[PDB]
Amino acid sequence: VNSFSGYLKLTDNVYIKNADIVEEAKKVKPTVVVNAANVYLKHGGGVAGALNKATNNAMQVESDDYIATNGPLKVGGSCVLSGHNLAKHCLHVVGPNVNKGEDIQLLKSAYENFNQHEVLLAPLLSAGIFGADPIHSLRVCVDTVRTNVYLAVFDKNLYDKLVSSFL
Numbered sequence: 799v800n801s802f803s804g805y806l807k808l809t810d811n812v813y814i815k816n817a818d819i820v821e822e823a824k825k826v827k828p829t830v831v832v833n834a835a836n837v838y839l840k841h842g843g844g845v846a847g848a849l850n851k852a853t854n855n856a857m858q859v860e861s862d863d864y865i866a867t868n869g870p871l872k873v874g875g876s877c878v879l880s881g882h883n884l885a886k887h888c889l890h891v892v893g894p895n896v897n898k899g900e901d902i903q904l905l906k907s908a909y910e911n912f913n914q915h916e917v918l919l920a921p922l923l924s925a926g927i928f929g930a931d932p933i934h935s936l937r938v939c940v941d942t943v944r945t946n947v948y949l950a951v952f953d954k955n956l957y958d959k960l961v962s963s964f965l
């Protein structure tokens with residue numbers, strides 16, 4: 799039993815809700831919130847910009863030190879950093895950005911990072927401003943993640959399409 803509320807159950811382990819991931823994280827304070835990151839951990843817009851803003855830019859400051867030490871992530875890769883005021887940890891995961899020409903096949907590799915954590919609050923990887931088909935992202939999530947994932951879909955209209963079209 800966990801403190802996530804109002805989710806629709808899609809499979810044994812995948813749940814979904816129309817919600818703002820920032821407001822969800824502040825309410826639940828999950829062990830792990832997933833950020834839709836880029837390789838430079840530059841949290842400018844989309845989910846990343848919103849999460850970072852909610853941390854008063856502390857996420858960006860921590861991220862800049864991480865990059866200065868370790869260099870960029872790989873597309874499909876991840877790193878664990880602080881969750882600041884939002885969660886215990888933030889798992890920064892880089893899905894392929896179609897608006898940069900990156901290989902959508904890397905989306906499965908990106909979701910594999912979730913399997914290292916028993917429970918996660920997450921957005922749909924490569925959706926929104928990353929330019930991939932969200933229906934496809936949800937399918938890859940369900941077919942790749944085996945741990946317990948609580949998906950927050952910001953756009954109510956898109957949420958309804960994802961539910962109604964889910965196989």
Ligand SMILES: CC[C@H](CO)Nc1ncnc2[nH]ccc12
Pocket residue numbers: 817818819820834844845848921922923924925926927950951952953956
């Ligand atoms: C990734 C595509 C979805 C479509 O809604 N984007 C989001 N989902 C949940 N929380 C969010 N916070 C800011 C953006 C955002």
Ligand SMILES: [Cl-]
Pocket residue numbers: 843844845925926927928
């Ligand atoms: Cl987005």
